[PDB]
Amino acid sequence: APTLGIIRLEHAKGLDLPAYETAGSAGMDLRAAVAEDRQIVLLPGRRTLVPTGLILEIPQGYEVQIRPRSGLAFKNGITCLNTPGTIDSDYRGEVKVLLINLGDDDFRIERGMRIAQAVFAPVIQPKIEERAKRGAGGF
Amino acid sequence: APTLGIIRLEHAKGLDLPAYETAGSAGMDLRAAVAEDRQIVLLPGRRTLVPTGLILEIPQGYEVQIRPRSGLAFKNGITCLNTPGTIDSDYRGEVKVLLINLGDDDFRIERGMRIAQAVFAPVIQPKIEERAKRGAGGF
Amino acid sequence: APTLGIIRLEHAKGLDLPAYETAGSAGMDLRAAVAEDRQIVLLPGRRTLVPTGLILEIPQGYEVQIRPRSGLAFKNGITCLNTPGTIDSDYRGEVKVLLINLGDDDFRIERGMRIAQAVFAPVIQPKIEERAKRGAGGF
C-alpha cells in the first residue's frame, strides 16, 4: 500500500494520530487539536476552522477527502461546509476542518473531539481535450 | 465485479431495490421507505433521518457514499447534511438518509420518493507514518 | 490515461478551460461563465445555478465530482449545495454549479470567478444482490 505521512504540530502533541478502527473502515476520525480547558462556541449558522495540528504528506497519485461525521450531523446539525474537503499531494499546510452549525443549539468544540473523517483515495488526472460541436449531472 | 448485498427490511417490501439506470450511471437512486399514506413534513432549516429499509453488505475493500440528488437540491433546497455519507464494509444497520431543508418551503417526504444517490467505490487504507519536522487543502 | 472531452458553449468562449495546476493536483477549478459586466447577487440563504459554459464528455467507466472550493467556503460561507455533485458518462447537458450562500453577506458572482473544483474518478457498478435475513454509516 501507499503510505500517508503525518507531521505533528505542537498542539497535536498528546493526541492519538488518525487510524483506521478496523480492516473494514473507510475513513479515519480526525480530532480537534484545540487548547486544553478551552470550550469554543459555534453558534447557529456560524462557521469556523478547527485545527487538527497535523500536516499531511500525501504521496503523488493520491488525495485525502475530509468528510462529515454522521453523528454530529444528526445530533447537532454540524457538518463540514466544504465537504468533501479536498487535500492534494502538494498541500503541506496544517489540516483544518471547516465546521458549520446548521442546527439550533450552541455547539461546543473541545480538545480531542472527533470532528470529521478522512478518506484516502487514489486520484487521476485525465487528459483534457477540447472538442467541437439523460445521465446524472443536471437539475 | 464486486457484489453489493442488500437485505430488505419489512418497510422496504414492495419498493424497487436500488439499481443503475444505464451502463454509464455513476450512482443508484435511493428511495424513502416511509409508511404509505403518510406525508412527513420537513420545515425550513430542519433535518431528519429518512429510512430506506435497506441493510447493505458492502464487501471488504469497498465503501458506499450517500450523495445528494441534484434536482431536489435545486428545486427545493434539500440536501444530505452529512454528504458524502460514508457507509463502510462493517456497517450492518439500516441505511438512513439525513436530509436537511436549506430552502424556504415546507418539504414533503413521501413513500418511494428518490432522496439520495449511492455511489459504490473501492476504498484503501494507507499505512499511517508519523514523520518529523501550494496545493488544495487550505482556506 | 483516460481523456475528458470538453465542448465549449458560446458563453465560455474566452475563458481558460479547466486544467490541473500541477502533477499533484486532485481537482480542476471551474469558472463562472456568466455575462461580462454583470454582477449576480446571491443573498444569505439563497441558492442559484451558475453556468460554466462547458459540456463534459466523460468516458464510460468514469465520473466527475463537483466539490466546493475551500476558500469561498471559509471567506464567504459559499458552498455547493449538492456536493459532491455527480456528473456521469451519459450527461451531455451544460455543467452548472449549484451555489448556496450559508454566510451573512451578500455574495457577488462575476465572470471568471472560480466557483468549484472538479475531480475526475473511475466509477464502478457492483452486481446488486438481494439477500435474506459497528462501522461507519449510522447516526
Looking at domain B1-139, its CATH class is: mainly beta
Record: contact A90-B117, CB cut-off 8 A: no
DSSP 8-state assignment for residue A71: H
Residue spans per domain, chain A: 1-139
Cα B5 to Cα B14: distance, rounded to the nearest angstrom: 18
Helix (H, G, I), strand (E, B) or coil at B20: coil
The alpha-carbon gap from C126 to the nearest alpha carbon of chain A, in Å, equals 17
Mutate to test the interface with B, among C25, C82, C130 (most CBs of B within 10 A): C82
Cα A112 to Cα A51: distance, rounded to the nearest angstrom: 11
Q: Let me know: does A115 contact C109? Beta carbons within 8 Å.
A: no
The alpha-carbon gap from B78 to the nearest alpha carbon of chain A, in Å, equals 12
Longest dimension (CA), chain C: 62
Q: How far is CA B132 from the centre of its chain?
A: 39
Cα B92 to Cα B88: distance, rounded to the nearest angstrom: 9
Written as one letter, the residue type at A2 is: P
- 3-state helix/strand/coil string of A39-57: CEEECCCCEEEEEEEEEEE
Is beta strand C78-80 parallel, antiparallel or unpaired with respect to C127-131?
Answer: unpaired
CA distance readout (Å), C50 to A95, B103, C109: 29, 17, 8
Place of cell 447537532: A76
What was the experiment behind these coordinates? X-ray
Nearest by Cα to C27 from A84, A31, A24, B80: A84
Q: Which three cell numbers stand for residue C115?
A: 466557483
Residues placed in the known binding site of B for substrate: 69-71, 82, 86-88, 96
Which residue from C26, C49, C91 is facing A123, i.e. has the nearest CB?
C26
Residue B120 forms beta bridges with which residues? B64
Written as one letter, the residue type at C96 is: K
Residue C128 forms beta bridges with which residues? B4
